[PDB]
Amino acid sequence: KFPRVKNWELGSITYDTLCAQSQQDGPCTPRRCLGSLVLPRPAEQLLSQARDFINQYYSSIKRSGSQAHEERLQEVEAEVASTGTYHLRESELVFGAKQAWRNAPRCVGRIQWGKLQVFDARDCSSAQEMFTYICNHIKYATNRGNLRSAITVFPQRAPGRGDFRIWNSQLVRYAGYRQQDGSVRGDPANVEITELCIQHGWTPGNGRFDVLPLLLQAPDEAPELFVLPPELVLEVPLEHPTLEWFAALGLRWYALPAVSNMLLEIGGLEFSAAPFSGWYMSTEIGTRNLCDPHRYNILEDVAVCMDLDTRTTSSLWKDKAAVEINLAVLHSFQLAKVTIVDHHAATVSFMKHLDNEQKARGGCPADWAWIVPPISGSLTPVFHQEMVNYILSPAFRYQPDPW
Amino acid sequence: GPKFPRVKNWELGSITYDTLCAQSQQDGPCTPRRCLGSLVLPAEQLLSQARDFINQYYSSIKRSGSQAHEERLQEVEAEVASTGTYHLRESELVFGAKQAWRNAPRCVGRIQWGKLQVFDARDCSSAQEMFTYICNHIKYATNRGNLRSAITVFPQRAPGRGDFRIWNSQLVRYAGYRQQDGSVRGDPANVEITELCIQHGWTPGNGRFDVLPLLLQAPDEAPELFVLPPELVLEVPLEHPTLEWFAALGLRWYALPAVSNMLLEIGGLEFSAAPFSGWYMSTEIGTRNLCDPHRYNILEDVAVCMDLDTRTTSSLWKDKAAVEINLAVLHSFQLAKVTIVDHHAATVSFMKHLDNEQKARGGCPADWAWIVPPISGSLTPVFHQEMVNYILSPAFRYQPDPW
Ligand code: HEM
Numbered sequence: 001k002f003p004r005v006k007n008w009e010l011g012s013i014t015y016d017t018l019c020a021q022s023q024q025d026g027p028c029t030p031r032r033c034l035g036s037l038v039l040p041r042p043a044e045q046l047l048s049q050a051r052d053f054i055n056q057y058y059s060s061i062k063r064s065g066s067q068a069h070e071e072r073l074q075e076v077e078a079e080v081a082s083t084g085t086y087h088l089r090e091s092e093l094v095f096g097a098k099q100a101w102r103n104a105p106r107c108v109g110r111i112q113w114g115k116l117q118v119f120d121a122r123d124c125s126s127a128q129e130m131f132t133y134i135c136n137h138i139k140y141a142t143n144r145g146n147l148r149s150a151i152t153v154f155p156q157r158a159p160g161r162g163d164f165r166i167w168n169s170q171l172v173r174y175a176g177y178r179q180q181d182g183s184v185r186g187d188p189a190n191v192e193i194t195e196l197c198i199q200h201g202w203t204p205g206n207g208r209f210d211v212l213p214l215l216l217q218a219p220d221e222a223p224e225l226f227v228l229p230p231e232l233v234l235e236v237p238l239e240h241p242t243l244e245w246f247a248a249l250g251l252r253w254y255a256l257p258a259v260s261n262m263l264l265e266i267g268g269l270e271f272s273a274a275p276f277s278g279w280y281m282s283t284e285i286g287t288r289n290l291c292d293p294h295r296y297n298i299l300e301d302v303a304v305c306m307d308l309d310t311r312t313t314s315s316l317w318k319d320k321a322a323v324e325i326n327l328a329v330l331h332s333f334q335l336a337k338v339t340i341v342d343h344h345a346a347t348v349s350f351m352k353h354l355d356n357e358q359k360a361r362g363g364c365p366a367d368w369a370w371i372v373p374p375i376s377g378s379l380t381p382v383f384h385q386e387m388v389n390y391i392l393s394p395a396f397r398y399q400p401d402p403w
Numbered sequence: 404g405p406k407f408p409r410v411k412n413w414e415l416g417s418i419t420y421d422t423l424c425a426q427s428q429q430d431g432p433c434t435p436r437r438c439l440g441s442l443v444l445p446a447e448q449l450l451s452q453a454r455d456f457i458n459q460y461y462s463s464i465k466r467s468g469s470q471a472h473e474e475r476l477q478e479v480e481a482e483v484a485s486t487g488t489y490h491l492r493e494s495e496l497v498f499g500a501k502q503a504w505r506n507a508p509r510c511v512g513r514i515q516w517g518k519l520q521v522f523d524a525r526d527c528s529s530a531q532e533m534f535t536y537i538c539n540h541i542k543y544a545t546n547r548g549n550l551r552s553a554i555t556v557f558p559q560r561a562p563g564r565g566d567f568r569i570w571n572s573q574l575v576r577y578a579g580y581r582q583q584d585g586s587v588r589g590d591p592a593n594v595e596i597t598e599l600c601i602q603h604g605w606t607p608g609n610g611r612f613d614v615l616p617l618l619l620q621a622p623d624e625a626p627e628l629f630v631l632p633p634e635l636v637l638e639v640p641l642e643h644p645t646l647e648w649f650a651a652l653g654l655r656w657y658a659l660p661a662v663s664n665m666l667l668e669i670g671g672l673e674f675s676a677a678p679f680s681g682w683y684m685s686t687e688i689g690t691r692n693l694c695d696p697h698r699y700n701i702l703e704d705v706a707v708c709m710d711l712d713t714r715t716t717s718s719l720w721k722d723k724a725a726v727e728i729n730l731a732v733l734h735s736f737q738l739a740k741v742t743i744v745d746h747h748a749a750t751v752s753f754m755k756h757l758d759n760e761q762k763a764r765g766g767c768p769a770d771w772a773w774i775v776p777p778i779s780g781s782l783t784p785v786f787h788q789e790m791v792n793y794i795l796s797p798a799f800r801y802q803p804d805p806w
Pocket residue numbers: 097101104106107108109110112116149150151276277278279280281284341370396
């Protein structure tokens with residue numbers, strides 16, 4: 001029933017008993033494992049998801065089974081009874097957002113989960129107020145390049161009406177202009193979101209790193225367009241510690257990773273619009289975004305840069321150059337005084353987190369295939385550690401694109 | 404769409420469904436509540452399994468439902484009727500062996516599934532005789548560098564009577580000698596089996612790369628020790644194409660990967676000895692056996708020779724060294740004319756295998772975590788490929804070491 005979990009480097013063994021508190025089916029069954037798929041295709045329920053969540057918070061501040069807890073438990077019981085829903089108190093919502101991050105199986109940064117700036121933006125009622133809220137979050141989070149973890153919660157879903165949404169998947173991301181000649185200027189992964197932007201009447205540039213404007217949508221209104229003012233957006237040019245030419249490449253990435261399309265779920269309530277951010281691990285920029293073939297796919301150009309042998313796989317030019325890009329990403333961010341983290345440091349601190357969690361709750365749910373870096377997998381200690389995935393709440397879910 | 408796992412390739416945008424998994428007749432480790440993907444070690448019934456196997460066979464020869472098919476069935480029932488067990492026709496053994504390897508979710512090797520040499524050794528009655536079978540195997544399969552897939556099949560398990568069993572995990576393994584100051588000389592993987600060889604009479608070496616003897620067991624007889632004639636065991640001295648100093652590290656590997664401790668299960672018949680072999684993927688040696696902290700752990704040594712900053716993670720001295728070491732594996736094998744294959748080509752071709760299997764059977768069981776290499780993960784196409792993993796029979800399966 002409870003799983004043995006070995007580390008294959010140190011022959012050490014633990015037991016998840018946290019996953020006993022999973023109230024949510026994932027994709028696997030005893031017949032097949034679906035664990036590598038990325039995506040997954042009533043008052044009595046709400047009232048019970050609430051109760052529980054209230055129970056986490058009182059237990060969190062040690063004030064379990066007492067007056068303020070009991071009393072707050074009729075408050076929700078009565079609010080649902082009458083109106084089919086309730087609302088959170090600020091501190092409660094500060095406890096859930098943090099915890100939603102604690103429970104994110106696919107996060108390698110979860111050691112930081114205690115340290116989260118929570119902006120409560122639930123008193124928002126137009127896209128114009130959204131833009132401002134978002135604009136502050138960025139100024140705060142960026143901090144002249146000493147990045148800081150932040151989330152900003154906008155108002156919850158309501159049964160009678162459309163959601164507050166941000167159309168973008170991140171707050172910063174680059175244009176991807178599809179061209180006549182089948183090709184693409186800039187980031188291929190943001191083609192559809194660039195087009196959507198043009199359809200709502202944005203003036204588009206034509207470089208490789210045109211920062212996208214923001215499409216914010218308030219309940220039942222058509223979405224609106226807000227260009228982010230260039231100075232809130234911190235960018236970092238790409239140069240190499242020894243390779244003079246690397247620079248002359250025009251490569252650069254932005255400083256702030258802020259996910260802006262995921263849904264945040266606390267106590268059975270749902271926040272369709274709740275962007276969050278911390279800081280990048282080098283391998284998000286160096287390996288995935290520049291290195292993927294369906295993205296910027298600069299590898300071959302790096303390799304030709306270096307005058308290696310393009311003609312054959314077994315010379316390892318794929319791997320040699322990748323390596324320099326992650327080295328270029330780390331160097332370049334360190335020079336700009338922007339917070340970055342390499343995948344060795346990162347995963348090492350992730351192991352500490354599992355150990356921290358093992359003692360604190362009895363396990364930690366994690367998704368092996370997402371935690372292990374996209375290069376040098378076995379060279380990181382997370383490769384050698386078995387993990388469990390299950391679903392805890394508070395939680396970030398995926399949600400449909402609003403068009 | 405259909406109620407069958409939908410399976411996507413994120414690089415290409417392509418979609419398939421896996422109908423094969425419906426034929427899985429045996430549960431893995433997951434449930435809807437939790438995913439165990441990462442865990443390394445996750446009469447009436449006899450007739451039931453055999454019937455399915457025979458169907459499977461007659462299908463593969465297009466004679467499904469025919470006279471010869473219903474005849475073999477009745478014959479197989481009658482076999483089991485009076486004896487408890489049954490026996491496989493020669494060609495039934497050749498097909499189930501191939502089917503067992505085609506069904507192996509952890510093997511990236513599968514495109515070659517149809518090209519296997521099957522050595523029937525079901526006539527073998529002594530440990531002395533295994534040594535002989537085994538020596539022929541290595542001779543055949545090594546074929547002086549031009550390597551060849553093969554499997555030798557020893558007598559099946561049987562009521563009462565005890566098993567045949569190669570005790571070595573591989574036909575070729577380097578010794579692992581426990582020092583009197585905690586550390587190990589040689590492959591730490593093999594301390595347990597090394598100790599057993601000595602206890603059973605073997606005079607041991609004092610090296611990093613000593614080939615182990617063979618501990619062979621025959622029903623109810625004590626295991627017996629057999630030394631491989633050095634001339635039979637082909638090894639490769641490791642050199643680097645541009646770093647002249649690398650050769651001097653005294654590094655070497657052997658040419659033949661040959662698993663010897665797995666169970667081969669067909670039609671509910673179990674073969675407890677069935678060494679099988681193929682040819683290496685470069686990362687099995689370059690990255691795993693050489694760079695694992697718990698194996699030879701040569702990463703630091705190599706990085707010093709490379710003059711890398713090994714006091715900070717962010718230099719990517721690990722990544723840089725592992726590449727070189729892998730490149731030197733690839734190059735050492737090339738030069739000696741010994742069949743090898745680099746993670747890049749080897750995965751390009753698992754992609755092809757996937758497409759073939761889609762057409763032939765509607766799907767292919769795959770352990771993502773294992774199919775994806777320990778280095779340059781995202782840089783290979785399997786990284787972007789969702790996989791479905793279930794258990795199909797005939798299978799290779801783990802068994803408990805015999806002692
Ligand atoms: C502070 C440093 C942080 C680092 C280094 C970090 C790193 C990462 C990485 C590397 C991933 C998966 C990478 C990928 O998309 O391929 C990820 C996923 C995730 N992160 Fe973190 N993160 C950080 C902070 C945060 C914060 C503040 C939150 C929210 C409060 C967060 C929530 C999540 C969630 C929900 C996922 C899953 C995304 C998905 O399922 O698609 N992370 N993080």
